[PDB]
Design a protein around this nucleic acid. Structure first.
Ligand SMILES: O=c1ccn([C@H]2C[C@H](O)[C@@H](COP(=O)(O)NP(=O)(O)OP(=O)(O)O)O2)c(=O)[nH]1
Ligand SMILES: [Mg+2]
Ligand code: NA
Ligand code: NA
Ligand code: NA
Length: 317
DNA sequence: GACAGCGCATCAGC
DNA sequence: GCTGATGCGC
DNA sequence: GTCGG
């Protein structure tokens, strides 16, 4: 409905994050994009948009320009700028952020060809990010997410029947495509009260050749790469990003709330929590920080901060 | 003035 | 090695 | 960049 506007704000957001290194402006543009994306009318003016929370006079002015011309002069200049363009590109590699991107550009490394000739200047994460550059920008159709879910849940069951694996992220929100796979893992042996629980699962998924690379790995978070098996004579599936989080079993609901997102939804809800005198993270909700409050469902967390319960499908902001 | 909150990798200082 | 800061991404 | 105190 307002895709031209939300695309423009997202591009500005990315500019402020990647080039300007202004994270609060990035968050401000993303907030405006999100609230406009949810607005059920085709916006006719900057004035109309400015009635929405997160849209102020400056973004209102840009919407007026965009509506009038179909363009934004600010963005056309940014697109023409070689340095901005180089930095924006390099940050598309997983593991290259705003700072490393600017450093690479300084060193004359500013293209895919340059990165490929300079893998020795990349850390492990960046090297895998470059290896799968193309694959990682592809979306994952839900049909493939279902097959991936089936592999993960069954391999986890083979390790220990007491594991429970839940696929979260956009998938759990019902999305027809996902950017990656997010898995929440619990085991009754691991609670907030009291080894290798994550390792055992990762090793099993590597053994069956589902997990193909590791970006980072600790005792509670694994970030890596996976791939569906393909049939005889068929083109291979793209490699995909997968994250697995080991969550204390008694903190499952705070965990699944966090890992279901969206990210802007969590930011909104946590910010609203502070206004109501609570702080929420992926483990607990605590009063303003006191002792953790009892949580027996996702809805309980909504109740504390006086929000009507919203199903996962309605948290995609 | 504050902006959500945190895990892992990596570096500096000791 | 350990602690704390920073970068990066979820 | 936006906004509540
Ligand atoms: O900055 C963040 C990023 C992620 N998260 C949480 C919510 C998000 O839904 C979950 C997984 O992050 P992803 O980057 O995978 N986003 P998501 O699965 O929602 O969308 P996509 O389909 O693009 O992967 O982690 C945050 O709370 N803050
Ligand atoms: Mg995801
Ligand atoms: Na507004
Ligand atoms: Na990046
Ligand atoms: Na993710």
């Amino acid at each position: 409905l307002n895709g031209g506007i939300t695309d423009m704000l997202t591009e500005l957001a990315n500019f402020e994050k990647n080039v300007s290194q202004a994270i609060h402006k990035y968050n401000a543009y993303r907030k405006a994009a999100s609230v406009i994306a949810k607005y059920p009318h085709k916006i006719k003016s900057g004035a109309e948009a400015k009635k929405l929370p997160g849209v102020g006079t400056k973004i209102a002015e840009k919407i007026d320009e965009f509506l009038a011309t179909g363009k934004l002069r600010k963005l056309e200049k940014i697109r023409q700028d070689d340095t901005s363009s180089s930095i924006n590109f390099l940050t598309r590699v997983s593991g290259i952020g705003p700072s490393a991107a600017r450093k690479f550009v300084d060193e004359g490394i500013k293209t895919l060809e340059d990165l490929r000739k300079n893998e020795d200047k990349l850390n492990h994460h960046q090297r895998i990010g470059l290896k799968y550059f193309g694959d990682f920008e592809k979306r994952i159709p839900r049909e493939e997410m279902l097959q991936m879910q089936d592999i993960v849940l069954n391999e986890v069951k083979k390790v220990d029947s007491e594991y429970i694996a839940t696929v979260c992220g956009s998938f759990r929100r019902g999305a027809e495509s996902s950017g990656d796979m997010d898995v929440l893992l619990t085991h009754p042996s691991f609670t907030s009260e009291s080894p290798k629980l994550l390792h055992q699962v990762v090793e099993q998924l590597q053994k069956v050749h589902f997990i193909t690379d590791t970006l980072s790995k600790g005792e509670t978070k694994f970030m890596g790469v996976c791939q569906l098996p393909s049939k005889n004579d068929e083109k291979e599936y793209p490699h995909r990003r997968i994250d697995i989080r080991l969550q204390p079993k008694d903190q499952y609901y705070c965990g699944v709330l966090y890992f279901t997102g969206s990210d802007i939804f969590n930011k909104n809800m946590r910010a609203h929590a502070l206004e109501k005198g609570f702080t929420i993270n992926e483990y607990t909700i605590r009063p303003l920080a006191g002792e953790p409050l009892p949580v027996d469902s996702e809805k309980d967390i909504f109740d504390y901060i006086q929000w009507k319960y919203r199903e996962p499908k309605d948290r995609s902001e």
